[PDB]
Amino acid sequence: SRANDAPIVLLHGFTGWGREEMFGFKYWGGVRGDIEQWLNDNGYRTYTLAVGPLSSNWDRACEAYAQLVGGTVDYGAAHAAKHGHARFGRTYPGLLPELKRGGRIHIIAHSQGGQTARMLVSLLENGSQEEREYAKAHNVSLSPLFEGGHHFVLSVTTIATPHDGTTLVNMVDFTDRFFDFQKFVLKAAAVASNVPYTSQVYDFKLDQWGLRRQPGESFDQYFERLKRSPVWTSTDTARYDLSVPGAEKLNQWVKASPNTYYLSFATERTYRGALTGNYYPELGMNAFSAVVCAPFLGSYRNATLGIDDRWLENDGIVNAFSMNGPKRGSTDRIVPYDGTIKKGVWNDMGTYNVDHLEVIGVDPNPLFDIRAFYLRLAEQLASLQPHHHHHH
Ligand SMILES: [Ca+2]
Numbered sequence: 001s002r003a004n005d006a007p008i009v010l011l012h013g014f015t016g017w018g019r020e021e022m023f024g025f026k027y028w029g030g031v032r033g034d035i036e037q038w039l040n041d042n043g044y045r046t047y048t049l050a051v052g053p054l055s056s057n058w059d060r061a062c063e064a065y066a067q068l069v070g071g072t073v074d075y076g077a078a079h080a081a082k083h084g085h086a087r088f089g090r091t092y093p094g095l096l097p098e099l100k101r102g103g104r105i106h107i108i109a110h111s112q113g114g115q116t117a118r119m120l121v122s123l124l125e126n127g128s129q130e131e132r133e134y135a136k137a138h139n140v141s142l143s144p145l146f147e148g149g150h151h152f153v154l155s156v157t158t159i160a161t162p163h164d165g166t167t168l169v170n171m172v173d174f175t176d177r178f179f180d181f182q183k184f185v186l187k188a189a190a191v192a193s194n195v196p197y198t199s200q201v202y203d204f205k206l207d208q209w210g211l212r213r214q215p216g217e218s219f220d221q222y223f224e225r226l227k228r229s230p231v232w233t234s235t236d237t238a239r240y241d242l243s244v245p246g247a248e249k250l251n252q253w254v255k256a257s258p259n260t261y262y263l264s265f266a267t268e269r270t271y272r273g274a275l276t277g278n279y280y281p282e283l284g285m286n287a288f289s290a291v292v293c294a295p296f297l298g299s300y301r302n303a304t305l306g307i308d309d310r311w312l313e314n315d316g317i318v319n320a321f322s323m324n325g326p327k328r329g330s331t332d333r334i335v336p337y338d339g340t341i342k343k344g345v346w347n348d349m350g351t352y353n354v355d356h357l358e359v360i361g362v363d364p365n366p367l368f369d370i371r372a373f374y375l376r377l378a379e380q381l382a383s384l385q386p387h388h389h390h391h392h
């Protein structure tokens with residue numbers, strides 16, 4: 001039973017949006033309903049974050065912080081000068097003002113949101129030495145997020161997160177397919193990609209970059225312009241952070257806080273071929289994944305990059321091997337769940353048979369009791385004890 005009162009905060013990956021976006025079709029729930037609503041009705045206070053889907057984890061984090069405490073998004077002076085984008089972003093009212101008063105939160109994250117959640121914890125706790133130094137050498141102002149000392153997160157839960165990246169980015173035509181993936185997600189919500197909708201619909205929130213869908217332009221047309229923009233061609237991008245090498249760099253500095261609980265959930269929707277060693281998409285896998293991504297992920301090898309047989313099992317988007325926690329270029333410890341949730345370590349909760357999109361309800365799966373999954377997760381989060389008295 002209940003040991004803490006901390007609210008839950010939901011966070012997406014390389015696709016995602018606000019609750020008011022996509023005509024109310026939820027990222028968290030999809031065709032199965034509204035996950036946040038489910039948790040609230042069952043008494044687990046829950047909120048929802050919406051950050052730039054194609055943005056670097058660093059940008060998201062700066063966005064998350066601000067969206068949480070309120071204020072104007074500060075990407076940090078050293079960071080903005082480094083990558084040529086605006087230092088300042090969109091302003092937010094603050095979902096949880098209580099955070100500045102001593103309160104904590106639980107983050108549940110999907111896909112790339114996992115990387116972001118980890119980074120956010122790091123920045124909250126340690127800040128950025130680079131930013132502090134810059135501020136002092138150029139006499140510029142500094143955001144609190146970079147000063148360290150913030151203790152907002154009691155726990156982080158990751159679901160189908162590419163902690164060590166996804167080999168997907170290695171597809172010869174990754175660029176066009178990744179955008180076809182966005183198009184599929186749009187379709188999933190009954191939204192067309194070839195129609196110049198006047199209403200916002202899907203805000204990619206690229207304020208830092210000066211990018212936005214223009215009037216008369218469909219999603220298909222906007223994606224052609226995004227493809228050639230800095231959010232797809234620079235290192236400060238989700239595209240980079242997504243790669244195996246990118247994930248490893250991020251792992252070099254984004255470490256697990258000894259004051260925070262970490263939970264990992266893995267996904268797979270594949271079967272192994274006996275003659276080839278490869279992995280193939282199961283029945284029921286989202287269409288797109290099954291035709292476009294799955295075959296590549298379950299067959300792609302690269303020994304010079306350390307991609308071997310353990311990397312084949314995938315969930316249609318991300319290699320399963322990458323989900324339990326960051327390992328490549330990491331000092332984080334990963335411990336198998338033995339019935340007891342330990343602090344400052346990745347508690348590997350196992351592997352669940354559902355794809356990348358089914359786990360959040362964007363893709364239908366009648367055999368997966370989604371509500372029960374999230375509810376059981378909320379119960380475990382609530383039982384988390386802030387203080388663990390060392391015993392027999
Ligand atoms: Ca399915």
Ligand SMILES: [Zn+2]
Nearest residue numbers: 056059083236
């Ligand atoms: Zn940036």
